[PDB]
Amino acid sequence: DPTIIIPKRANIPTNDLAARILRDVKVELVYNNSLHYVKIRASVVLDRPAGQSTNAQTPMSSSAVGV
Amino acid sequence: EYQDKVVDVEVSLGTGFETPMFLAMHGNFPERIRFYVSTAGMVADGFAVGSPAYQFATNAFAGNFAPQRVAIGRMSIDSSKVDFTGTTEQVVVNITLNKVVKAVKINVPAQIATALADAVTADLTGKATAVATTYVTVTASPNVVSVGKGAGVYKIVNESSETVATVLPSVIAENHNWYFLATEARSDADIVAAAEFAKANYKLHIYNSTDVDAYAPENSAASVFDTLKSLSYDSLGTSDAGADVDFTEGSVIGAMAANDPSYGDSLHLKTMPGMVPFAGSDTQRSNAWSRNANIYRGLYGGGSYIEGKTSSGQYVDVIRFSHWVKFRMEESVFAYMKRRSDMGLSMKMSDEDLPVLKSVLMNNPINIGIRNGGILTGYDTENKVSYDPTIIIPKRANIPTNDLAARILRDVKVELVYNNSLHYVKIRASVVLDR
Amino acid sequence: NEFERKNRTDDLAILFDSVTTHTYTKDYNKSSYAVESKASDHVTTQDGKFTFSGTVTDSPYLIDPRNMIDRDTDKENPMLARRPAKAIEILELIADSHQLVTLVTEDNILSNYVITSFQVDRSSEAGSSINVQVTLEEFRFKRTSDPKKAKNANTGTKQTA
Amino acid sequence: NQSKILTLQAYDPAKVLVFIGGQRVSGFAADTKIVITRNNDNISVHAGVDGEISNALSRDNTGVMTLSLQNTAKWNGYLAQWQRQANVTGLIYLPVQVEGSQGLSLNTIGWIQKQPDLSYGTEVGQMDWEIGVLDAWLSPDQIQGIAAGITGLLGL
């Protein structure tokens, strides 16, 4: 999300008050990229679509052993 | 422009995908490639009847699916030969200066060889030269000279200092609206070089070989077919006695050209005009079959091709389909990106626009395949899997940051199943009687 | 398997944009008087009938060029091609010349069938399309020829030719 | 994504202009000014005997337009007089135009279909005129950026 910060009167140096200048205002943005190149990986089967295991359990996301 | 008639009627003649390119040796024009619609045009270009290019063009235009428009490649000539290692009238046709059609005649091999050379010298001798050595060499001076077979058993053998491996990168630059690739050199080195080029550019290579080693015993690997098999090259090879002299490559191309790749039309049993039946015995044919060297066979009450197996092993109709899928999928996605980017609304990797590719790909390539019978669909009762095509797209939460900097989308996956034809049938029965 | 066999010059094929129903029927008759007794020859076979209903629309969904209706139909503007008019021109010629048509159906294949009647209308509903009905019946059909197949023939009395 | 305002200026019922014959109409009532509807669908579908679907475009485009008015408006008298005159002579066709605000609009030729029913009660009643129109295709017109969008759609 964009953010904006504005100085408060307690942080303006006395010199800038004489010159009447405000600075250190800060903004933040994120740019959105377009798409240029795309790659495809096609596959043509000949005899039978590849079979899959009958393991109907939910696929675990991590290994129990961690040492 | 001003038209002097309310009605003007002209009655006249003449006028993976079709157009083939025949890489020939000649000098009848400066360009590297030219297109023709009939053999008549090639004669007007100084092609002598019986010449290599002429044999290919006439064979390709005579097929049941003849291509609309053939193409001739040009590689330079330095000398040409007429070989007389067999004899019985041995009429030969020479064309010089594009107009001088001097059909030399001789009748009855050194005698005929020297006799033919003598007859040429008797000519215009001021523009061409001949010399016997069994064969007789014919050389031009800066004059277009064309030599072709008229009758007899002799065979023409052109020779050139240029190499096929270097010309092919040249012809492609001029134009590339050609799919089939065929060459005249037919030497082991020349054929292999042509095969490698066809891969990187996605072209289909064709060649007929007269090698007797083709049907030699399977344990003997000495023919070209063995070399390509080892290198896993896709090139529709075959063995034929008329592979030279007549250049039957056109006949095979004549059966596939005018036929959309999406139909999956097999080449198993089609008839090729011009070819001659293979006379080898049963054991010889079995040997050649192991070589992936297809043969034209005179069948029960007829004659027909046998099998479209390439050197690697896969059936030919599959290869055309695989290339046809590559081309159409590539143009269809690109054709859509331009529209979005040309309205100011270029596509973004936002995970809200990527999914649209489901409709784009399913629209142009995939559905057209199903309506034509090329792609299977349904369910399988023993494997329990379905044949429906599937498409998977990655989400923004998986694209590495490296790609986002380069603006590249990778790892898209598609699945298809091909419809296989029928080639053989073998009945079995037993007449048991009741008791 | 057999649709792909049809070329564009000899074995012309016709496909309708939609077929709603088709029916096939045969008939037999027998003597209404008690037979003398086995005398199972007291029965005769009639010609089988076939009828169906279809439609041709200005907004086709499939324009496969192999169909003879779509010989030279524009790819991008189907309604300017005037497809319904193309079908009628074909239909009258087939019926008028008395062609022996061949029907390829769900279950079986029928041959030697001639068209005896058809109807065309453009009702207020289903505008931009035409409803078509056809009826067919069997045909029990029974020079340059090989002399080996020749048979003695006759021409009756003849006069100055 | 977050929330977004569809337009810049709010839809205003008084900005919708209704013209019959060439005069603006005033005297609308309740919470529904006009209702525009068609009589038949645009396409009728038919099933086949082997899965084919055949579609047929419709060639009838007549529709209805319900005008809701109070029974204290002079346009009631205008319409009644027009109906009597049309019955006597024969001229029944008059132009009808509706200029919508931030919405689709209409421009065609209409006629009076059915006279509403009066109902004198405790409160002030409502009369609904059915006006039939020749063509009932709504036009984007005021809405901008439509020509470019139309060419953007893909299809085969």
PDB file of N, CA and C in Angstrom, chain B residues 155-228:
ATOM      1  N   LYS B 155      22.626 -42.689 -66.283  1.00  0.00           N
ATOM      2  CA  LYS B 155      22.089 -41.818 -65.249  1.00  0.00           C
ATOM      3  C   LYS B 155      22.944 -40.564 -65.144  1.00  0.00           C
ATOM      4  N   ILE B 156      22.282 -39.429 -64.935  1.00  0.00           N
ATOM      5  CA  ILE B 156      22.964 -38.148 -64.830  1.00  0.00           C
ATOM      6  C   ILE B 156      23.497 -37.972 -63.414  1.00  0.00           C
ATOM      7  N   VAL B 157      24.703 -37.421 -63.312  1.00  0.00           N
ATOM      8  CA  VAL B 157      25.356 -37.187 -62.027  1.00  0.00           C
ATOM      9  C   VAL B 157      25.988 -35.802 -62.072  1.00  0.00           C
ATOM     10  N   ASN B 158      25.332 -34.826 -61.452  1.00  0.00           N
ATOM     11  CA  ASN B 158      25.886 -33.484 -61.383  1.00  0.00           C
ATOM     12  C   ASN B 158      26.876 -33.379 -60.229  1.00  0.00           C
ATOM     13  N   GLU B 159      27.853 -32.490 -60.389  1.00  0.00           N
ATOM     14  CA  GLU B 159      28.901 -32.282 -59.400  1.00  0.00           C
ATOM     15  C   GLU B 159      29.078 -30.789 -59.177  1.00  0.00           C
ATOM     16  N   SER B 160      29.381 -30.409 -57.938  1.00  0.00           N
ATOM     17  CA  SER B 160      29.518 -29.006 -57.585  1.00  0.00           C
ATOM     18  C   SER B 160      30.581 -28.858 -56.508  1.00  0.00           C
ATOM     19  N   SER B 161      31.321 -27.749 -56.568  1.00  0.00           N
ATOM     20  CA  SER B 161      32.292 -27.425 -55.531  1.00  0.00           C
ATOM     21  C   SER B 161      31.630 -26.915 -54.261  1.00  0.00           C
ATOM     22  N   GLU B 162      30.456 -26.305 -54.376  1.00  0.00           N
ATOM     23  CA  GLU B 162      29.727 -25.816 -53.220  1.00  0.00           C
ATOM     24  C   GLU B 162      29.191 -26.989 -52.404  1.00  0.00           C
ATOM     25  N   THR B 163      28.918 -26.725 -51.130  1.00  0.00           N
ATOM     26  CA  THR B 163      28.472 -27.749 -50.198  1.00  0.00           C
ATOM     27  C   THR B 163      27.075 -27.420 -49.695  1.00  0.00           C
ATOM     28  N   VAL B 164      26.259 -28.463 -49.526  1.00  0.00           N
ATOM     29  CA  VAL B 164      24.878 -28.272 -49.087  1.00  0.00           C
ATOM     30  C   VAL B 164      24.838 -27.629 -47.709  1.00  0.00           C
ATOM     31  N   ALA B 165      25.776 -28.004 -46.837  1.00  0.00           N
ATOM     32  CA  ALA B 165      25.739 -27.519 -45.462  1.00  0.00           C
ATOM     33  C   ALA B 165      25.810 -26.000 -45.392  1.00  0.00           C
ATOM     34  N   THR B 166      26.364 -25.355 -46.416  1.00  0.00           N
ATOM     35  CA  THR B 166      26.521 -23.907 -46.419  1.00  0.00           C
ATOM     36  C   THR B 166      25.454 -23.184 -47.226  1.00  0.00           C
ATOM     37  N   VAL B 167      24.907 -23.819 -48.262  1.00  0.00           N
ATOM     38  CA  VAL B 167      23.882 -23.160 -49.066  1.00  0.00           C
ATOM     39  C   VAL B 167      22.580 -23.026 -48.292  1.00  0.00           C
ATOM     40  N   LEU B 168      22.193 -24.060 -47.547  1.00  0.00           N
ATOM     41  CA  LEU B 168      20.892 -24.041 -46.878  1.00  0.00           C
ATOM     42  C   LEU B 168      20.703 -22.804 -46.017  1.00  0.00           C
ATOM     43  N   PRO B 169      21.682 -22.359 -45.233  1.00  0.00           N
ATOM     44  CA  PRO B 169      21.515 -21.095 -44.506  1.00  0.00           C
ATOM     45  C   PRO B 169      21.263 -19.912 -45.428  1.00  0.00           C
ATOM     46  N   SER B 170      21.609 -20.047 -46.706  1.00  0.00           N
ATOM     47  CA  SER B 170      21.406 -18.967 -47.664  1.00  0.00           C
ATOM     48  C   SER B 170      19.987 -18.964 -48.230  1.00  0.00           C
ATOM     49  N   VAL B 171      19.486 -20.130 -48.643  1.00  0.00           N
ATOM     50  CA  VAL B 171      18.160 -20.179 -49.253  1.00  0.00           C
ATOM     51  C   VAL B 171      17.097 -19.731 -48.263  1.00  0.00           C
ATOM     52  N   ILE B 172      17.239 -20.104 -46.989  1.00  0.00           N
ATOM     53  CA  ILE B 172      16.240 -19.748 -45.991  1.00  0.00           C
ATOM     54  C   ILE B 172      16.080 -18.243 -45.875  1.00  0.00           C
ATOM     55  N   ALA B 173      17.172 -17.489 -46.008  1.00  0.00           N
ATOM     56  CA  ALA B 173      17.088 -16.040 -45.883  1.00  0.00           C
ATOM     57  C   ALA B 173      16.174 -15.437 -46.942  1.00  0.00           C
ATOM     58  N   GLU B 174      16.284 -15.897 -48.190  1.00  0.00           N
ATOM     59  CA  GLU B 174      15.440 -15.349 -49.249  1.00  0.00           C
ATOM     60  C   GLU B 174      13.965 -15.565 -48.941  1.00  0.00           C
ATOM     61  N   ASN B 175      13.587 -16.791 -48.607  1.00  0.00           N
ATOM     62  CA  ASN B 175      12.201 -17.087 -48.280  1.00  0.00           C
ATOM     63  C   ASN B 175      12.157 -18.375 -47.477  1.00  0.00           C
ATOM     64  N   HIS B 176      11.089 -18.523 -46.693  1.00  0.00           N
ATOM     65  CA  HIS B 176      10.933 -19.704 -45.856  1.00  0.00           C
ATOM     66  C   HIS B 176       9.499 -20.221 -45.827  1.00  0.00           C
ATOM     67  N   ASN B 177       8.700 -19.970 -46.866  1.00  0.00           N
ATOM     68  CA  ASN B 177       7.354 -20.530 -46.962  1.00  0.00           C
ATOM     69  C   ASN B 177       7.401 -21.907 -47.622  1.00  0.00           C
ATOM     70  N   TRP B 178       8.236 -22.775 -47.060  1.00  0.00           N
ATOM     71  CA  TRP B 178       8.368 -24.136 -47.553  1.00  0.00           C
ATOM     72  C   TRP B 178       8.612 -25.062 -46.374  1.00  0.00           C
ATOM     73  N   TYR B 179       8.003 -26.245 -46.435  1.00  0.00           N
ATOM     74  CA  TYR B 179       8.012 -27.181 -45.319  1.00  0.00           C
ATOM     75  C   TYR B 179       8.838 -28.424 -45.600  1.00  0.00           C
ATOM     76  N   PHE B 180       8.659 -29.052 -46.757  1.00  0.00           N
ATOM     77  CA  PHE B 180       9.423 -30.242 -47.096  1.00  0.00           C
ATOM     78  C   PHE B 180      10.794 -29.856 -47.626  1.00  0.00           C
ATOM     79  N   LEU B 181      11.794 -30.670 -47.301  1.00  0.00           N
ATOM     80  CA  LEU B 181      13.169 -30.443 -47.725  1.00  0.00           C
ATOM     81  C   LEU B 181      13.692 -31.685 -48.428  1.00  0.00           C
ATOM     82  N   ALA B 182      14.210 -31.504 -49.640  1.00  0.00           N
ATOM     83  CA  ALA B 182      14.801 -32.597 -50.394  1.00  0.00           C
ATOM     84  C   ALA B 182      16.049 -32.087 -51.099  1.00  0.00           C
ATOM     85  N   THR B 183      17.013 -32.988 -51.289  1.00  0.00           N
ATOM     86  CA  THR B 183      18.311 -32.626 -51.834  1.00  0.00           C
ATOM     87  C   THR B 183      18.683 -33.581 -52.957  1.00  0.00           C
ATOM     88  N   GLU B 184      19.570 -33.108 -53.836  1.00  0.00           N
ATOM     89  CA  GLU B 184      20.019 -33.915 -54.963  1.00  0.00           C
ATOM     90  C   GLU B 184      21.288 -34.696 -54.651  1.00  0.00           C
ATOM     91  N   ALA B 185      22.169 -34.152 -53.808  1.00  0.00           N
ATOM     92  CA  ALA B 185      23.481 -34.765 -53.610  1.00  0.00           C
ATOM     93  C   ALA B 185      23.364 -36.229 -53.209  1.00  0.00           C
ATOM     94  N   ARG B 186      22.586 -36.524 -52.169  1.00  0.00           N
ATOM     95  CA  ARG B 186      22.302 -37.898 -51.778  1.00  0.00           C
ATOM     96  C   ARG B 186      23.554 -38.663 -51.361  1.00  0.00           C
ATOM     97  N   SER B 187      24.654 -37.957 -51.119  1.00  0.00           N
ATOM     98  CA  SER B 187      25.811 -38.587 -50.502  1.00  0.00           C
ATOM     99  C   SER B 187      25.591 -38.706 -49.000  1.00  0.00           C
ATOM    100  N   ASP B 188      26.343 -39.609 -48.372  1.00  0.00           N
ATOM    101  CA  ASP B 188      26.176 -39.825 -46.939  1.00  0.00           C
ATOM    102  C   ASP B 188      26.435 -38.546 -46.158  1.00  0.00           C
ATOM    103  N   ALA B 189      27.493 -37.814 -46.511  1.00  0.00           N
ATOM    104  CA  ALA B 189      27.776 -36.558 -45.829  1.00  0.00           C
ATOM    105  C   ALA B 189      26.695 -35.521 -46.104  1.00  0.00           C
ATOM    106  N   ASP B 190      26.259 -35.404 -47.360  1.00  0.00           N
ATOM    107  CA  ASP B 190      25.272 -34.387 -47.706  1.00  0.00           C
ATOM    108  C   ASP B 190      23.933 -34.664 -47.036  1.00  0.00           C
ATOM    109  N   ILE B 191      23.495 -35.921 -47.033  1.00  0.00           N
ATOM    110  CA  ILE B 191      22.198 -36.252 -46.451  1.00  0.00           C
ATOM    111  C   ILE B 191      22.185 -35.932 -44.964  1.00  0.00           C
ATOM    112  N   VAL B 192      23.242 -36.329 -44.251  1.00  0.00           N
ATOM    113  CA  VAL B 192      23.288 -36.097 -42.810  1.00  0.00           C
ATOM    114  C   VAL B 192      23.247 -34.606 -42.510  1.00  0.00           C
ATOM    115  N   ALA B 193      24.024 -33.812 -43.250  1.00  0.00           N
ATOM    116  CA  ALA B 193      24.026 -32.373 -43.019  1.00  0.00           C
ATOM    117  C   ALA B 193      22.637 -31.786 -43.215  1.00  0.00           C
ATOM    118  N   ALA B 194      21.923 -32.238 -44.245  1.00  0.00           N
ATOM    119  CA  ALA B 194      20.565 -31.758 -44.466  1.00  0.00           C
ATOM    120  C   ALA B 194      19.645 -32.159 -43.322  1.00  0.00           C
ATOM    121  N   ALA B 195      19.826 -33.363 -42.781  1.00  0.00           N
ATOM    122  CA  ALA B 195      18.969 -33.813 -41.691  1.00  0.00           C
ATOM    123  C   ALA B 195      19.129 -32.929 -40.462  1.00  0.00           C
ATOM    124  N   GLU B 196      20.366 -32.565 -40.121  1.00  0.00           N
ATOM    125  CA  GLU B 196      20.590 -31.731 -38.945  1.00  0.00           C
ATOM    126  C   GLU B 196      19.959 -30.356 -39.116  1.00  0.00           C
ATOM    127  N   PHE B 197      20.063 -29.777 -40.313  1.00  0.00           N
ATOM    128  CA  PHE B 197      19.487 -28.457 -40.540  1.00  0.00           C
ATOM    129  C   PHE B 197      17.975 -28.480 -40.367  1.00  0.00           C
ATOM    130  N   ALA B 198      17.319 -29.535 -40.853  1.00  0.00           N
ATOM    131  CA  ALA B 198      15.865 -29.606 -40.760  1.00  0.00           C
ATOM    132  C   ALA B 198      15.392 -29.582 -39.314  1.00  0.00           C
ATOM    133  N   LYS B 199      16.175 -30.145 -38.392  1.00  0.00           N
ATOM    134  CA  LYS B 199      15.782 -30.146 -36.989  1.00  0.00           C
ATOM    135  C   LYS B 199      15.659 -28.727 -36.454  1.00  0.00           C
ATOM    136  N   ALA B 200      16.765 -27.983 -36.455  1.00  0.00           N
ATOM    137  CA  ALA B 200      16.783 -26.674 -35.816  1.00  0.00           C
ATOM    138  C   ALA B 200      15.767 -25.718 -36.415  1.00  0.00           C
ATOM    139  N   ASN B 201      15.352 -25.936 -37.661  1.00  0.00           N
ATOM    140  CA  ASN B 201      14.403 -25.057 -38.330  1.00  0.00           C
ATOM    141  C   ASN B 201      13.014 -25.667 -38.443  1.00  0.00           C
ATOM    142  N   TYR B 202      12.806 -26.862 -37.899  1.00  0.00           N
ATOM    143  CA  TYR B 202      11.503 -27.518 -37.920  1.00  0.00           C
ATOM    144  C   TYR B 202      10.998 -27.695 -39.350  1.00  0.00           C
ATOM    145  N   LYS B 203      11.746 -28.494 -40.109  1.00  0.00           N
ATOM    146  CA  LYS B 203      11.368 -28.892 -41.453  1.00  0.00           C
ATOM    147  C   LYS B 203      11.367 -30.410 -41.524  1.00  0.00           C
ATOM    148  N   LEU B 204      10.618 -30.945 -42.479  1.00  0.00           N
ATOM    149  CA  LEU B 204      10.506 -32.386 -42.667  1.00  0.00           C
ATOM    150  C   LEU B 204      11.445 -32.809 -43.786  1.00  0.00           C
ATOM    151  N   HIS B 205      12.347 -33.735 -43.482  1.00  0.00           N
ATOM    152  CA  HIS B 205      13.334 -34.188 -44.449  1.00  0.00           C
ATOM    153  C   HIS B 205      12.873 -35.471 -45.125  1.00  0.00           C
ATOM    154  N   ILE B 206      13.121 -35.563 -46.430  1.00  0.00           N
ATOM    155  CA  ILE B 206      12.749 -36.723 -47.230  1.00  0.00           C
ATOM    156  C   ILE B 206      13.928 -37.093 -48.114  1.00  0.00           C
ATOM    157  N   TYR B 207      14.145 -38.394 -48.305  1.00  0.00           N
ATOM    158  CA  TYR B 207      15.223 -38.858 -49.165  1.00  0.00           C
ATOM    159  C   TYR B 207      14.973 -40.302 -49.571  1.00  0.00           C
ATOM    160  N   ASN B 208      15.236 -40.606 -50.837  1.00  0.00           N
ATOM    161  CA  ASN B 208      15.212 -41.969 -51.346  1.00  0.00           C
ATOM    162  C   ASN B 208      16.636 -42.413 -51.638  1.00  0.00           C
ATOM    163  N   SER B 209      16.989 -43.610 -51.182  1.00  0.00           N
ATOM    164  CA  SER B 209      18.349 -44.115 -51.298  1.00  0.00           C
ATOM    165  C   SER B 209      18.351 -45.416 -52.083  1.00  0.00           C
ATOM    166  N   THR B 210      19.352 -45.574 -52.948  1.00  0.00           N
ATOM    167  CA  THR B 210      19.529 -46.785 -53.734  1.00  0.00           C
ATOM    168  C   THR B 210      20.453 -47.792 -53.063  1.00  0.00           C
ATOM    169  N   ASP B 211      20.932 -47.499 -51.857  1.00  0.00           N
ATOM    170  CA  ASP B 211      21.906 -48.364 -51.204  1.00  0.00           C
ATOM    171  C   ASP B 211      21.369 -49.782 -51.072  1.00  0.00           C
ATOM    172  N   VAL B 212      22.197 -50.760 -51.447  1.00  0.00           N
ATOM    173  CA  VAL B 212      21.816 -52.158 -51.287  1.00  0.00           C
ATOM    174  C   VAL B 212      21.926 -52.581 -49.830  1.00  0.00           C
ATOM    175  N   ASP B 213      22.720 -51.862 -49.038  1.00  0.00           N
ATOM    176  CA  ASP B 213      22.853 -52.184 -47.624  1.00  0.00           C
ATOM    177  C   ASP B 213      21.563 -51.937 -46.853  1.00  0.00           C
ATOM    178  N   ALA B 214      20.584 -51.264 -47.460  1.00  0.00           N
ATOM    179  CA  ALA B 214      19.349 -50.961 -46.749  1.00  0.00           C
ATOM    180  C   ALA B 214      18.669 -52.232 -46.256  1.00  0.00           C
ATOM    181  N   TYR B 215      18.584 -53.252 -47.111  1.00  0.00           N
ATOM    182  CA  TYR B 215      17.948 -54.513 -46.754  1.00  0.00           C
ATOM    183  C   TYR B 215      18.962 -55.606 -46.442  1.00  0.00           C
ATOM    184  N   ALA B 216      20.228 -55.247 -46.235  1.00  0.00           N
ATOM    185  CA  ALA B 216      21.210 -56.215 -45.779  1.00  0.00           C
ATOM    186  C   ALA B 216      20.772 -56.785 -44.430  1.00  0.00           C
ATOM    187  N   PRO B 217      21.431 -57.844 -43.960  1.00  0.00           N
ATOM    188  CA  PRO B 217      21.036 -58.438 -42.678  1.00  0.00           C
ATOM    189  C   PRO B 217      21.071 -57.409 -41.557  1.00  0.00           C
ATOM    190  N   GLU B 218      20.104 -57.528 -40.644  1.00  0.00           N
ATOM    191  CA  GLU B 218      19.919 -56.502 -39.621  1.00  0.00           C
ATOM    192  C   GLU B 218      21.191 -56.283 -38.812  1.00  0.00           C
ATOM    193  N   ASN B 219      21.960 -57.348 -38.578  1.00  0.00           N
ATOM    194  CA  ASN B 219      23.182 -57.213 -37.790  1.00  0.00           C
ATOM    195  C   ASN B 219      24.201 -56.298 -38.456  1.00  0.00           C
ATOM    196  N   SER B 220      24.063 -56.050 -39.758  1.00  0.00           N
ATOM    197  CA  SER B 220      25.019 -55.230 -40.506  1.00  0.00           C
ATOM    198  C   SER B 220      24.506 -53.797 -40.541  1.00  0.00           C
ATOM    199  N   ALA B 221      25.216 -52.908 -39.849  1.00  0.00           N
ATOM    200  CA  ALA B 221      24.878 -51.489 -39.821  1.00  0.00           C
ATOM    201  C   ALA B 221      25.916 -50.725 -40.636  1.00  0.00           C
ATOM    202  N   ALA B 222      25.621 -50.499 -41.915  1.00  0.00           N
ATOM    203  CA  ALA B 222      26.548 -49.797 -42.796  1.00  0.00           C
ATOM    204  C   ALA B 222      25.843 -48.744 -43.643  1.00  0.00           C
ATOM    205  N   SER B 223      24.516 -48.791 -43.692  1.00  0.00           N
ATOM    206  CA  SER B 223      23.768 -47.874 -44.535  1.00  0.00           C
ATOM    207  C   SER B 223      23.534 -46.549 -43.817  1.00  0.00           C
ATOM    208  N   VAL B 224      23.071 -45.561 -44.588  1.00  0.00           N
ATOM    209  CA  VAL B 224      22.751 -44.257 -44.016  1.00  0.00           C
ATOM    210  C   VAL B 224      21.685 -44.403 -42.941  1.00  0.00           C
ATOM    211  N   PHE B 225      20.696 -45.263 -43.191  1.00  0.00           N
ATOM    212  CA  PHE B 225      19.583 -45.407 -42.260  1.00  0.00           C
ATOM    213  C   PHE B 225      20.076 -45.740 -40.858  1.00  0.00           C
ATOM    214  N   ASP B 226      21.127 -46.555 -40.755  1.00  0.00           N
ATOM    215  CA  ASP B 226      21.675 -46.882 -39.445  1.00  0.00           C
ATOM    216  C   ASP B 226      22.263 -45.651 -38.766  1.00  0.00           C
ATOM    217  N   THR B 227      22.936 -44.789 -39.530  1.00  0.00           N
ATOM    218  CA  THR B 227      23.537 -43.601 -38.936  1.00  0.00           C
ATOM    219  C   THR B 227      22.474 -42.667 -38.375  1.00  0.00           C
ATOM    220  N   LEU B 228      21.417 -42.407 -39.146  1.00  0.00           N
ATOM    221  CA  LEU B 228      20.349 -41.544 -38.659  1.00  0.00           C
ATOM    222  C   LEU B 228      19.636 -42.161 -37.466  1.00  0.00           C
TER     223      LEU B 228
END
